[PDB]
Amino acid sequence: GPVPSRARVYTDVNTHRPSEYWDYESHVVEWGNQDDYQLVRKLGRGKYSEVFEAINITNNEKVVVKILKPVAAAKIKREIKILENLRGGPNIITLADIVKDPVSRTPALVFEHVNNTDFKQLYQTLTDYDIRFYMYEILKALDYCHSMGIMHRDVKPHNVMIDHEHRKLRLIDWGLAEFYHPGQEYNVRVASRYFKGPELLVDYQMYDYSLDMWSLGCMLASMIFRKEPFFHGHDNYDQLVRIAKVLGTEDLYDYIDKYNIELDPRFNDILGRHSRKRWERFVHSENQHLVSPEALDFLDKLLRYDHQSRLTAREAMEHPYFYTVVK
């Protein structure tokens, strides 16, 4: 069947560390006091949780409370363990407490307060410099979690908190994150449609940290080219065709042939034959101020079919695209 794959970096992290580190199911939660928190207002609702502005009445500090919706107990312990493992890491959201919500009877995670700059304002007014600055901040978070043997699996703007007034960034919502274990087959139903890596789209389960680097590439492409989303698929199948119309079909076939992956025969009628496009074709007078030869070269090294060939987060930090960023 398919040829196995392993990450080219951080394969050994979960071997070198003790079992309690990654064996999330064995972790015992020391529950905090739910009466310490007063909910102020709802901030958002997703498929797996509701997030609220809150006050920790014990220290009069603003906090964010994420109340989990009833789901498998394994998904809840996994997020808790990942958050505790990553706590203190650069640009990782800080988990401050874990309480039992009295109404839902589910865990409520308490985080450090965040103040999101309006999403439309960020998309529409971040400069070329600000894009590079914040991309570098995301890379610090990704190299940290990858170096800690964790893949985020849901990198997208909704999961990046930017307090522009304070040049502060946090990588949030670790609910889909997982521990990377070489040879482990993972669920391909992760990430939002437009951010899914070719590995997910061809049903290749032995993926790794490099999935996050593809999603980072999609987020960057959309920002610099002013095309939201960059790969605009109608469904999961058309999503791969949209990617093939840019990266070309020849390299897609080279990719699946390397891993002995067979495409779903549904693709025989819809994929066609497409040449690889030069990135300069997406440049126009309304996005030229966000594009540079360095930006294109960086994007070219993230958006590769072969998950083993993409820049890693640490290599990405060395790229000329970030030379202008004050470090």
Ligand SMILES: O=C(CCNCc1ccc(-c2ccccc2)c(Cl)c1)NCCC(=O)Nc1cccc(C(=O)O)c1
């Ligand atoms: O929806 C959001 C985030 C919204 N992000 C907006 C945004 C993020 C990045 C970029 C960006 C793109 C390319 C390059 C550089 C930057 C842009 Cl243009 C916009 N926040 C509101 C909800 C919230 O704060 N949730 C939350 C808070 C704390 C913890 C958790 C959690 O699940 O752990 C959730």
